Design a protein around this ligand. Sequence first.
Ligand code: SF4
Ligand SMILES: [Zn+2]
Ligand SMILES: [Zn+2]
Ligand SMILES: [Zn+2]
Lengths: 189, 103, 538, 99, 146, 512, 97
Amino acid sequence: MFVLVEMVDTVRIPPWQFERKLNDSIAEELNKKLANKVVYNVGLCICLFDITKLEDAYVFPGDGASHTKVHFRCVVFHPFLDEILIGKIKGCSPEGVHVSLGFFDDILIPPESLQQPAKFDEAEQVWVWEYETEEGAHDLYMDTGEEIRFRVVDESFVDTSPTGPSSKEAPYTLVGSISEPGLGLLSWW
Amino acid sequence: AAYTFNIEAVGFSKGEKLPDVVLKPPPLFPDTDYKPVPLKTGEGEEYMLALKQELRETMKRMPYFIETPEERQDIERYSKRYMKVYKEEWIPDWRRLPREMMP
Amino acid sequence: KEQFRETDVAKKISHICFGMKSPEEMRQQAHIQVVSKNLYSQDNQHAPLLYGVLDHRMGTSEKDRPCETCGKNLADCLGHYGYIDLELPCFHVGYFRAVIGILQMICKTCCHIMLSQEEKKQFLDYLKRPGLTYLQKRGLKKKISDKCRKKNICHHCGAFNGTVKKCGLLKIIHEKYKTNKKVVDPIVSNFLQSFETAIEHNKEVEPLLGRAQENLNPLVVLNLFKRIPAEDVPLLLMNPEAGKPSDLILTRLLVPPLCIRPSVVNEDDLTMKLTEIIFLNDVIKKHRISGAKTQMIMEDWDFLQLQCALYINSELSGIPLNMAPKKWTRGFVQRLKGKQGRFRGNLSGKRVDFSGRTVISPDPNLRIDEVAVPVHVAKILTFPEKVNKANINFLRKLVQNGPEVHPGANFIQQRHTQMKRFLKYGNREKMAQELKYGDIVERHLIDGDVVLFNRQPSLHKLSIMAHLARVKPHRTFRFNECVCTPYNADFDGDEMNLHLPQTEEAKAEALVLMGTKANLVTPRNGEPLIAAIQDFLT
Amino acid sequence: DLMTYKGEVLGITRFGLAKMKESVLMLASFEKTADHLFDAAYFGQKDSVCGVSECIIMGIPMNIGTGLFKLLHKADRDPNPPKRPLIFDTNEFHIPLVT
Amino acid sequence: DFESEFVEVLNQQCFKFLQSKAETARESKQNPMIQRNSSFASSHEVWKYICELGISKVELSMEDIETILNTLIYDGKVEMTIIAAKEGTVGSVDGHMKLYRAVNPIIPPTGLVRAPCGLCPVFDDCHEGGEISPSNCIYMTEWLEF
Amino acid sequence: TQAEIKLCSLLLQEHFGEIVEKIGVHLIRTGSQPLRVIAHDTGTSLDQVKKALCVLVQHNLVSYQVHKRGVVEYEAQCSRVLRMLRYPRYIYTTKTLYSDTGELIVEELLLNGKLTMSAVVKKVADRLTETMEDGKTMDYAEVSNTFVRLADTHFVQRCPSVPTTENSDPGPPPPAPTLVINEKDMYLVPKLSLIGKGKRRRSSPIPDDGIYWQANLDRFHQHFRDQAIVSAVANRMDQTSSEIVRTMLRMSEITTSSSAPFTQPLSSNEIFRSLPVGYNISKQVLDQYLTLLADDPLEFVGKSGDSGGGMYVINLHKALASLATATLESVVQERFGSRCARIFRLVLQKKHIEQKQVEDFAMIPAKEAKDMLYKMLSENFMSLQEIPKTPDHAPSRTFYLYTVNILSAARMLLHRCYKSIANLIERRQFETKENKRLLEKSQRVEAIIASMQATGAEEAQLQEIEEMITAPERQQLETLKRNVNKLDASEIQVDETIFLLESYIECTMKRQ
Amino acid sequence: TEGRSRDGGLRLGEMERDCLIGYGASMLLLERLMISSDAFEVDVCGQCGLLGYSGWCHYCKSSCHVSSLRIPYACKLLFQELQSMNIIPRLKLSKYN
DNA sequence: TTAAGTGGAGCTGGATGCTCTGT
DNA sequence: TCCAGCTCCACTTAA
RNA sequence: ACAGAG
Ligand code: SF4
Ligand SMILES: [Zn+2]
Ligand SMILES: [Zn+2]
Ligand SMILES: [Zn+2]
């Protein structure tokens, strides 16, 4: 479900690390700058996948470190629209249902895309669903959060960059839907 | 305190009534005494008002309005044939147009 | 969780493109509008005013009071601009000779450039060739303006275009109505008789009307230059992405940050010029309301042009006697130009630290590559030795001795920190134990340091050479007299300079390239200069 | 040869140097320091920071001397290293769907 | 000045007399050449009428009103044509006589004044991205409301 | 012309879009260029440049010529881009002289740029079906019958023709065919025997090929010039006198240059038969009008002859100078008030004048006149002569004669107009873009009514439209429309000012 | 500062500069005439080429193009004296590679 | 006869060494 | 205190 | 601003 992103960078290798093969030292110094961070237009970087090319290791004047331009590919969790995923409920809230996908927690099920039978919680945090035959409106998305299946209808990037001179909002947002048949808790289908 | 130039060469022969010191800068949109003339109305001047709005809505739909091409669509899907933006194409008269412009 | 951001975007300057700001880009840079003439409040609190010059929204030039825009001290702040609005346009004195040039090329009636279709086609294709250099542009401007001056009628509107020339300090005149002994031309004959209302009431018009001409002025030339077609702007050799003809006439003026003009010179001459500009802008604005005569308004405008021009360049030649400054003042041009200006005094050469000076005296028991440095200079001139596996146990002993014993150290600095611990205080035997790799110990100058050595007048490269220091008790600098001939030194109370290179790369370039053993022969004829002298020849 | 390489005998005066040297900041750091800076504003000239004098002004190391060459570190490196094969998204299993 | 609060009422009073007299000929509609002649007033009759109204104790001397009527020309409200003094009740100039008639303006007010831009005092400062912009102008935000 | 290029950028974006306004503005700003560097200076791909250039040449907005070594250079026609703004006034004025068929002819010619005579009579017939009902077709005969009447009146004219390759230069094909205009056949229509009917949008080889036709914009300006002169005479003299002027100008149409100081003279003997029969005027009274017009110091007419009875010419240039001055005085009056407009007409008649004479002549006191005088300098309505006593030019020893120059103040005032329209468009587009949220929302509710309008459409959908939360929002959409309708209407009305000022500037230039 | 009374220091003149060029000593000339006098950092916006502050460009009202350049302070001073003269030094910065 | 291209003469603006050491 | 460019004005050729 | 020193 992931993608590769082809990226370039100039990596500074300091001179105490000259006792190590360069392809090992470069990869470590790249994971330290990319892992668990969102790169704006492309998504959340998991780790470096491989180095595809490695240019000349210049030494610039006034420093002793070596600078080398690296060509590399990185595994990034970018899910395409209308994809099916499975994940666990962390919380119920008035604004909707919040889903976790392992590492990723900013998954929104909006109430405009929830199941139609029940749509306004009666002063309760937990969301509800009513079926006439079974369960009299007490069926619920439990706080323990047994895995739901959801379909990612929308995603948005918000540019979390400094405004004004210098001297926490979620930068990657994902919006699901659950209204289709076959979506929901796994035990329902 | 005196300045570099002599103030008597500018004026002020009496020795008083120098202009005051501006404290706050003047506002960006100062108030004006005069107002615009109200518009011309009529059965003929309003028909030009409606024809002007019908030329925007038509010339955006006519084939001369070359829209910018889309790119970097992520994946292919079966909803591509259902969502293909169909529009007929105009062709010029290549006698008048130069040879250097054939597509 | 967090978004990626690059940590430290170091970049390299690729080129400087010069240009000029439009009056409405000035308003977009500047943080405040300046309107008040008074430097300081009248009351004893000694605050500056909120919307006058010396306002701390434009930065600070004293540690006592911080900048308002970014809340940061003198050491941290780059400075910020304000602007002054000018009620009437003025010529910029640096661009004035270029203002006339354009008015000699453009038609004064429709603002098209006075060239035929063929000459326009020619020069526009000259300006296409890749790699057009600065000299070729200056030559092309001459040939373009040459043709425009030999034409007297416009190909586009047909109006007559006489000579444009200077007519005194910051004034321009256009000879639209020349007159000749021949049969009188139609259009000039209409103008000469239009004066009928003036002649009825003013007798003196009738001699002087032969000398009546179009007095070009900033209110007109700003209105012409807005109307020049953008197709014809490249043929004036103006680059249309660095500026426009409209920008050459200043209707707005930036005031520099306070750190350009520090608070105790009290105020700098730029700050007092800007007061006078603001005052005269209030004089002119009031006289328009109170009904002064045109003789007064024009004179005041003439003052505003002078005060702006003397703000930029205070050495103007043609200043009338009833307008001349009583005192000399630094304009911007005077602090750029000359021996004590920026380019010679502060940019090409500058005062440097880790330097010393003393009387020189002989010592033949030193080698020719050595120089004796007194202990009093060696305890001051420190070299930053980076701590590593080869020198850790050596630098510990130097840290223990501390500032007062000669093989010692004045400062210690931790790995990723930029403050410096002054090693005179604290217990040095504890600070020696807590040395880590990557710390910097600022040790004293010791035997075997590469040190630069230079007599004050330098006529050739051998007047500055690198020597290995050796520390000795007496105060003078000392070297073997075989090296007197390169320095032209004579030990009669002569003084010489010493520089301690603060970088490992600067040691190597000094040692390999500038060492005395590498410089036994002069570059000129290849003859030896370090050799025997008197009492070594006898 | 410096005096005659442009076909005319050019002096070592400010006038000869203005015909030999293109750089504004070099020209402005010798004589007529005001006029050269206003002309560069008018012409919109861009200045190559390559020359010796403007390198010392801008604080960058000059090309001549020790600046003419670059140093590479002789690290133990393998350029164009072995790539990880993809398993899924290879071309032989994914012939296009549409005609 | 003579008196600024004095001339301002005489300015309209003279034009009302010329407007009245022009209205008589337009209502007469007998013969357009004769009607054009009838549309002119005498330079002496307008003075003798204004001084007879009795606005002020000071006498409205003919040598002043002869130059006051020029202000109605520069407001664009009246024409003046000199005629030879072939016949006239006084003939106030040797061989010459002066006629006055009210006239309409040449054209209605233009299109630029109808737009707010035509009257703006900060027109030189207004730009797309600036502090003063059409997208944030107060002169348009007011004038579009009524 | 930075105001012109800013205004041209908006017009091309609204009528043609983003990847063609880039090429259009670049041609206006730089002048003529070969094709390869149009792409390189812009960064557009070569295929998009060809698409952009071919649409701009279709609507006659760029020309092309062959040059040395056979390269084509394109060249933008700046004034013809601005005349896209006057298109509704053209479509209205054809509806005044001609029926609704003549309205739809000019609409198709202006929107497609060039059409063949067969193509226009087809597309006018198709579109006029919506104006009619109950079986009656539009037929191609009554379309062409108006087109040939449009042609004779010169409102429509043939485009420059391709040359006959067989007659001239047979051989290797040229890079561009070097088109030329033929003066004989501009107003000579092809004859068409084919007829037919317009299709009512049910949705369930060509003889005049190469005879392209386009609107003759210069003929509309000769119409609008007449209306400015005729209406000025209608105010000053009488409606009857205005008709006499309208009679002279309508005869002048076919036999005079669109740029000349004087038209062809006509005798009063031949004016008499041309005036409509309802005007109960004798020939002798007609000569009373003509002398009283010629007596006017505005001099809209003059004598210029004596043969065949009374001879009279109407002055084209001198009428425009009056109208440009009346335009120039009217903006002074509204911006600074009547007392300042007094001073403007004073200095204009007393051609050079000083402050002490201005207060004397206008009966405006000091500290009120001088404030008005000094503002008129700073807005470039008025000038200083500055006759010197000495070659010092010192302010203490010179007499500052004021002057008004009409030509420079007309060019200055025109520059204010181009920026004024650009501002009005910028306000409309700002308020349209910032309400795209509500405009989509108000579309989608109406889309529920438009889509599935009749087939299977139950009545149970008509109330669910106002059930959305957009019902309170509606107050904003009434404010939107009243804003846009005032901004659009002012964008039309400032064009009345441009045409008056530009026609004066157009005629004083000889372009020698 | 200027001299012995003020613990001033010593001058590397225009003539000593000419000596060091003739040795080809490019890094020593950088150490003496930048690092041990007036080393500084400025925020430069890569879009407009003007100087900014604190990683913010007031001209553009954006934060993303700004970058740090190592510059002598006297040149920063020159680049602000010249802008007040309305001679604008618009910089362009490449990466250091 | 005069339009015009080029000689000769006067006006204008630029420049004139490197540092410390004190009052 | 010494020295290049810029502009004004007489001085032949040429139609 | 003046005097020194090399
Ligand atoms: S401020 Fe607004 S209303 Fe006034 S001229 Fe500018 S855009 Fe027009
Ligand atoms: Zn600050
Ligand atoms: Zn012209
Ligand atoms: Zn910026």
